[PDB]
Amino acid sequence: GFKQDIATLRGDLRTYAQDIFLAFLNKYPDEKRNFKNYVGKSDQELKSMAKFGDHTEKVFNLMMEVADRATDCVPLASDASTLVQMKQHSGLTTGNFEKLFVALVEYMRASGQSFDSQSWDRFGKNLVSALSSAGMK
């Protein structure tokens, strides 16, 4: 289930983080706007940019912590506040996060593996709700 899935993702985190974040940027091309330097790049080109691998892995490092500290896929309000307040997220609306989680669930559904895609979908929804509550537009 959810907790095992955190262990699975952490076991190959660099490759899952890149592959899910590329899935997100390819499904929702307008989202590359937040990351100007990513425009006009193939997946392979992106995977060779230092910044890409480092920000993607740090996103997933913190996403897995937030998932790990959740009760029944409901994240801590303190984690939601941290995400809303980060000055790298000044731009962002819950829609940015909704789309990331749609791509993540899709990725899990398409994978050969017994990911608990329904739990991730609930986690995404509950995070978006927690982010709204903590004051994200």
Ligand X SMILES: C=C(C)[C@@H]1CC=C(C)CC1
Query: Annotated binding residue at 36?
Result: yes
DSSP-based three-state secondary structure for 71? strand
Single out the residue of 52, 101, 107, 123 in contact with ligand X (rule: CB under 6 A).
52
Does 68 participate in binding ligand HEM (rule CB under 6 A)?
no
Does 117 participate in binding ligand X (rule CB under 6 A)?
no
124 contacts 2 by C-beta, under 8 angstroms: no
Backbone angles phi, psi at 10, to 5 degrees: -55, -30
**Residue 119 binds which of ligand X, ligand HEM, none (CB < 5-8 A, kind-dependent):** none
Does 16 participate in binding ligand X (rule CB under 6 A)?
no
Q: CB of residue 136 vs ligand X: minimum separation in angstroms?
A: 16
What's the distance, Cα to Cα, between the start and end of the chain in Å? 31
- When the beta carbons of 8 and 99 are compared against ligand HEM, the nearer one is 99
* Long-range contacts of 33-38, Cβ-Cβ distance < 8 Å, separation of 24 or more: 34/91, 34/92, 34/96
Which spans of this chain sit near ligand X (rule: CB under 6 A)? 21, 35, 38, 52, 55-56, 59
